Amino acid sequence: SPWFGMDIGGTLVKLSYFEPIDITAEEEQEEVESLKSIRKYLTSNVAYGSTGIRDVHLELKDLTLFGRRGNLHFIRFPTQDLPTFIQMGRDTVLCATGGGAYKFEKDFRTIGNLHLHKLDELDCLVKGLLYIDSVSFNGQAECYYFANASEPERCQKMPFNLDDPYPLLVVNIGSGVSILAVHSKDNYKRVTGTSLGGGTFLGLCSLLTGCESFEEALEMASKGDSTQADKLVRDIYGGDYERFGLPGWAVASSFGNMIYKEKRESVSKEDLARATLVTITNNIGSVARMCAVNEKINRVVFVGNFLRVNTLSMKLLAYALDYWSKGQLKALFLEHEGYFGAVGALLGLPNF
Amino acid sequence: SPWFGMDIGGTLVKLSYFEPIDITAEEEQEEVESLKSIRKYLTSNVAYGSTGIRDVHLELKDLTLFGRRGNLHFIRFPTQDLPTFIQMGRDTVLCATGGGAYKFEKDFRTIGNLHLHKLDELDCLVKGLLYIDSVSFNGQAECYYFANASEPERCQKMPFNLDDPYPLLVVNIGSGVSILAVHSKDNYKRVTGTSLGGGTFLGLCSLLTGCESFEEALEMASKGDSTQADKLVRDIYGGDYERFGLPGWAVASSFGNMIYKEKRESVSKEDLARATLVTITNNIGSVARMCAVNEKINRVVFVGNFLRVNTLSMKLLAYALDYWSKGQLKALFLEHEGYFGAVGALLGLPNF
Ligand SMILES: Nc1ncnc2c1ncn2[C@@H]1O[C@H](COP(=O)(O)OP(=O)(O)NP(=O)(O)O)[C@@H](O)[C@H]1O
Ligand SMILES: Nc1ncnc2c1ncn2[C@@H]1O[C@H](COP(=O)(O)OP(=O)(O)NP(=O)(O)O)[C@@H](O)[C@H]1O
Ligand SMILES: CC(C)c1ccc(CC(=O)N2CCN(c3ccc(C#N)cn3)CC2)cc1
Ligand SMILES: CC(C)c1ccc(CC(=O)N2CCN(c3ccc(C#N)cn3)CC2)cc1
Ligand SMILES: [Mg+2]
Ligand SMILES: [Mg+2]
DSSP states (O other), rough: EEEEEEEEEEEEEEEEEEESSOOOHHHHHHHHHHHHHHHHHHHHHHETHHHHHHHHGGGEEEEETTTTEEEEEEEEEEEEGHHHHHHHHTOOEEEEESSSHHHHHHHTSSSSSOOOEOOOHHHHHHHHHHHHHHOTTTTSSSSEEEEEETTTOOEEEEOOOSSSSSSSSEEEEEEEEEEEESSSSSEEEEEEESSOSSHHHHHHHHHHHHHOHHHHHHHHHHHOOGGTTEEEEEHHHHOOOOOTTTTTSSETTTTTGGGSSHHHHHHOOHHHHHHHHHHHHHHHHHHEEEEEEEOOOOOOESGGGTTTTTHHHHHHHHHHHHHHTSSOOOOOOTTTTTTHHHHHHHHHHHGO | OOOEEEEESSSSSEEEEEEOOOOHHHHHHHHHHHHHHHHHHHHSSEETTTHHHEEEOOEEEEEETEEEEEEEEEEEEEEEHHHHHHHTTTEEEEEEEEESHTTTHHHHTSSTEEEEEEEEEEEHHHHHHHHHHHHHTTTTTSSSEEEETOOOTTOOEEEESSSSSEEEEEEESSEEEEEEEEOOOOEEEEEEEOOOSSSHHHHHHHHHHHHSSSSHHHHHHOOOOOGSSSSEEEHHHOOGGGTBBOTTEEEETTGGOOOOOHHHHHHHHHHHHHHHHHHHHHHHHHHHHHHHHHHHHHHHESSSSGGTTTHHHHHHHHHHHHTTTTTTSOOOOOOOOHHHHHHHHHHHGGGG
């Protein structure tokens, strides 16, 4: 049986796969050809079908897991294409997490003799996050922050140490947003959540701009000016609102300038894409800040695939969290952003 | 000099006007004709120009203020039309608040010999709110809640007593959102705010549906089905997420179903209008709940003109705040929702 970990979310399926690299002579002979064929298919291709992608740059090499040396691979594809994955599989013990482990439980059992073990979404997230950080990213730090995020001339990616991680606030930006307070390896709760996450950015941006992919919406947002759509504090006061420390550049009303017909007619798609990203990102950071104050936690780590190849949101979160907390909260990020549930599911394998 | 109070916000100008009803014989003769003309223009018309509206139903009659009996009138018009108001005025001491008191200060001084006194936006809000509640709404309660908001068969408007108001959380839903913790009549702070307020609803709904007015967007939203655009918990899990008490009907990702091209092509404008309202309203209630927990305040009062003629948002806030706090927080509303700053400004008149 191959060692898989699967996180089936609302938008993306994430898969962690452990490739043994210490296969002896007798072990190779005992291999069934279908197992040799699966391992060869996964390691010789980086694109699977039309929508499966292996993130090669995230691979953990020479990892000791369950007493064996191997490489840990990270693979993703849209949940919309899970029926194709299952039909491929019908041509093994599967630890699965995310909402789709329950929604698609009966579909996985169409694969004969397959043993599906459902694991809690946020239980695997914590276990996966603490494991990857503990084994490091091939000797490098798994966690990083943006030093001097208030100054763009100095704002640069710098590694961050989480050797004693607790207490920790985890902000999981997937389709929606889950916010976790991690007090120890076995003591953690879901503080709250918000429904304004990656799916809101993607869904709204698709309505407003007609973009056809997450990467395309990010590309449009990088060329736009969100202030063409948003109403700023200085549009209401003429400048700063000194009494309550609100700078003129702060957004008073997201999309607030779109109440005027002439401004809707002069706004571009790139402006709307950017305003969507800024609106979603600032609201996530603001909610994260409120939970951090309530939980008395000053380390806020952001995960989930809303932030993959999305440096704009990361810098925005880094600047905003630092500015609005007056340097008392630090925005932290992790190289394996969206795969921690898949890893945590894989780690539940010995329990069966 | 007529007694005006003016709150010039980002979207709407609010005006409170005190009409003396105890004018003696000698007082009437000493009246200048322009003062008789202004008083007659305001009390004999309910529509001023093309965009000014007097909310007759809110009028406080036989009010004793500054030692005189009179009626308190409530008038509104768009800030976009303030130049017309000023040009009418150029054909008096003015206490003004809101961001526009600073942005348009030089324009008000084009009226000769006019004395403009700027007052803090949230200072007038608190003073105005506590005053209107103290004098009551013509013998009726100014404050009301929705009893049994969890059950639609019993959900009905019921008056609420605020005779000892403190402590109080005030959630001012204007263009953006301001959240205030009121600890006493002179001790209060702005806890935080969010940029997802009435202007976001109006601005986004205009982009998505082409609606031309706030009332039209509310009319569209009442006919729509927000679940056509939003991704629910049961769309991800297949049902409830029992582990963390998330019901299947809860919104996991606002506009999250708009990532699929076929769902964008079958969604209606009414659905998008409703999803915009639900998204904005739930986020406001969720932020209000987080501030209430942090401030240890269980009375949350919502004001601002996002909720005028908007019972859908009020019931939504009443149900959501009660559900997610398990009955520990009460959503409260006030009949004079958007006029408290204008009233508070009027009350600063003796200080000059
Ligand atoms: N290739 C991609 N396709 C789709 N969305 C992408 C892609 N890359 C990044 N994203 C973003 O990542 C978000 C989903 O991230 P992810 O953490 O995988 O959520 P999820 O687990 O699938 N949904 P959830 O059930 O809430 O956990 C989307 O809403 C997008 O904003
Ligand atoms: N006739 C109307 N015209 C415009 N907006 C309306 C109207 N009726 C209700 N609204 C809503 O009320 C919101 C503005 O309420 P209001 O409390 O007056 O904010 P404001 O003071 O003008 N802006 P702010 O500077 O943030 O205080 C708008 O964003 C709409 O959602
Ligand atoms: C007074 C009226 C006009 C008004 C002004 C401003 C606002 C909005 C507001 O007050 N703010 C914006 C959002 N802010 C953030 C943003 C990101 C992070 C992080 N990480 C934390 N906070 C808080 C302040 C409404 C109405
Ligand atoms: C686990 C993933 C799929 C997920 C589920 C759910 C959510 C959203 C969420 O968790 N919630 C919705 C917003 N909620 C509100 C709404 C109104 C009020 C008030 N007044 C208070 N809370 C909190 C819970 C994200 C990701
Ligand atoms: Mg997920
Ligand atoms: Mg206002």
